[PDB]
Amino acid sequence: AHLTSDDVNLPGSDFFRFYRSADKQEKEKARIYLLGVLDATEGKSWCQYSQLQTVTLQEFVFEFFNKLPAARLHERAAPLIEEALATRFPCK
Amino acid sequence: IAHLTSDDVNLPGSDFFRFYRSADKQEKEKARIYLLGVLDATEGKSWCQYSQLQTVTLQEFVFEFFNKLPAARLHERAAPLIEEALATRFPCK
């Protein structure tokens, strides 16, 4: 019910819940979490920022999580996000 | 950048560290959430690991790393700087 900076190993299912929360404060925190993940991986496992709007990255993360089975949602959020982005925008 | 928001892609070290030290507890908490996204994305991979370490120890080492950073390096991106802080201190293996 609340995303905080102690939530290490954030699971995908909680991330996605906050990410689509009716509470826009939790939505914004989930998106700032996603921002630390993107900034940490961009140009390493997926490419790139001047090729893509942040809204495009957020919508692609949304679609990716929205299609995921619960078996996979229960895994860690960050590697799932990074997987969204890698398959779709690889560096090669 | 007067407030940390999720539009802040490629957040510079200078902005991250300002928010991370802010007197506004809410800005401070957002900066710590940006940090959590970076920890989650890099843990077990460039640095190790969440068991023996509480979040606060991690947060304090990141703070000390930034405090000692030469001014020249604050233009670098916050995420790789946070990763360097943790890799040096909590190397894998």
For tokens 């560096």, the residue is: A91
Resolution as reported, in Å: 2.0
Residue B22: left if φ>0, alpha if ψ -120 to 50, beta else—which one? Answer: beta
Any idea where the domains of chain A sit in the sequence?
1-92
CA distance to A3, A18, A28, A29, A30, per residue, from A24 (Å): 12, 9, 6, 9, 10
Interface check for B86 against chain A (CB to CB < 8 A): the answer is no
Question: What is the crossing angle of helices A24-41 and B78-89, to 10°?
Answer: 70
- What are A15's two structure tokens? 């991330």
**Which residue does chain B place closest to A40, by CA atoms?**
B79
Nearest to B4, CA basis, from A25, A40, B20, B65: B20
Interface probe, candidates B20, B25, B34, chain A, greatest A C-beta count within 10 A: B34
How many helices (H) and strands (E) in chain B? 4, 0
What is A1-92's CATH number, 1.20.120.1200, 1.10.890.40, 2.60.120.380, 2.130.10.30?
1.10.890.40
Closest residue to A82, CB basis, from B29, B33, B41:
B41
Q: Do B34 and A37 touch (CB under 8 A)?
A: no
**Which residue does chain B place closest to A33, by CA atoms?**
B37
For tokens 């961009």, the residue is: A42
Helix (H, G, I), strand (E, B) or coil at B2: coil
Q: Residue A89 has what DSSP assignment?
A: S
Q: How many CB pairs under 8 A join A and B?
A: 96
Identify the CATH class of B1-93.
mainly alpha
Interface check for A22 against chain B (CB to CB < 8 A): the answer is no
Q: Residue B10 has what DSSP assignment?
A: S
CB A12 within 8 A of CB A65: yes
- Elucidation technique: X-ray
Interface probe, candidates A15, A39, A59, chain B, greatest B C-beta count within 10 A: A39
**Chain centre distance of CA A82:** 7
